[PDB]
Amino acid sequence: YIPGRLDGKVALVTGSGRGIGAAVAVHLGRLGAKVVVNYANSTKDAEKVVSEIKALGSDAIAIKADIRQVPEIVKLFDQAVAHFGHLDIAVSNSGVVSFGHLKDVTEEEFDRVFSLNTRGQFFVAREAYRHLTEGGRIVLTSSNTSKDFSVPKHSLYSGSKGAVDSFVRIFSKDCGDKKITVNAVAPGGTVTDMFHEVSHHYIPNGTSYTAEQRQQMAAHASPLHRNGWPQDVANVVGFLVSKEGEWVNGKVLTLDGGAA
């Protein structure tokens, strides 16, 4: 039993077919956990992550569930436990980004973002609490924009993740009766499909720079002069879900390489 390792444990990661979730899933597998790879649309990518986790010597299964639908969350966790027998670690990663001036945010856009980023994560946590073994781990995903980084026209998203920050602090109090810790990671700009989709909103006149230039400017936001990568987030989740992370509980760790 090596320190920081997860041998014999079972982890579930939402939205782990690609992006940050994919890194987290492969990493938990690398640490020796068996992994449930949840996806909503990226079936082939989820299979690739599963194949990669098996190739590094662990086991994994891909399970489709739309995390906007609470009954599908319940089913996801039921299927997870049915397959591996038990569940120790739940990482809630699924999310969507949005931009718009307050004046033009519609009801439908509010609901598209909150239903996944906030409502979905809340019920992923609920189901995690119900299904997890004593001494388990829950990690939710927030963002540096919730508290540390203020971007015009980003109010909906920033708020969606501000709620998650508050959740984890109080979740840790409730989840303590099963000795489960609850934390969140709040990444800054991390190079994924989402990054490239929206990097132009984070930069003044972002549209008149190339996509590569925009990534390079995000690199210079950190005093380390490099971009955040999915592995950066995965490294921290892996520590939080280990035995050694136990005393970190009820906290949000901003992961922006010192940009804030």
Minimum Å distance from CB 214 to ligand HHF?
5
- Residue 144 is assigned to a ligand binding site: no
Interaction pattern, residues 65-104, with ligand HHF; x per rule: CB under 6 A: --------------------------------x-------
Would you say 16 is a known binding-site residue?
A: no
Neighbours of 82 (CB within 10 A): 10
Residue 118 binds to ligand NAP (criterion: CB under 6 A): no
The partner in contact with residue 50, picked from a second copy, ligand HHF, ligand NAP, none with C-beta cut-offs of 5 to 8 angstroms by kind, is none
The answer to whether 20 is annotated as binding is yes
Q: Tell which positions 14-43 bind a second copy, by CB under 8 A.
A: none
Residue 155 token pair: 């109010």
Burial of 173 (0-12, 13-18, 19+ CB in 10 A): exposed
The verdict on whether 173 is a catalytic residue reads no
For 75: left if phi > 0, alpha if psi spans -120 to 50, otherwise beta; the answer is alpha
Q: Does 221 bind ligand HHF (CB under 6 A)?
A: yes
Q: Which of 142, 155, 158, 160 is catalytic?
A: 142
Contact code string over 95-114 relative to a second copy, x by CB under 8 A: ------xxx-x-x--x---x
- Whether 44 is a known active-site residue: answer no
By the rule CB under 8 A, 179 interacts with a second copy: no
Hunting for tokens 């979730």 — which residue is that? 21
What one-letter code names the amino acid at 3?
Answer: P
One character per residue 50-79, x = contact with ligand NAP (rule: CB under 6 A): ----------------xxx-----------
- Which amino acids are annotated as binding site for NADP(+), given as ranges? 15, 18, 20, 40-42, 66-67, 93-95, 157, 161, 190, 192, 194
Task: Show which residues are catalytic.
Answer: 142-143, 157, 161
Which residue ranges make up the site for ligand HHF (CB under 6 A)?
A: 97, 143-145, 188-189, 194-195, 198-199, 202-203, 214, 217-218, 221
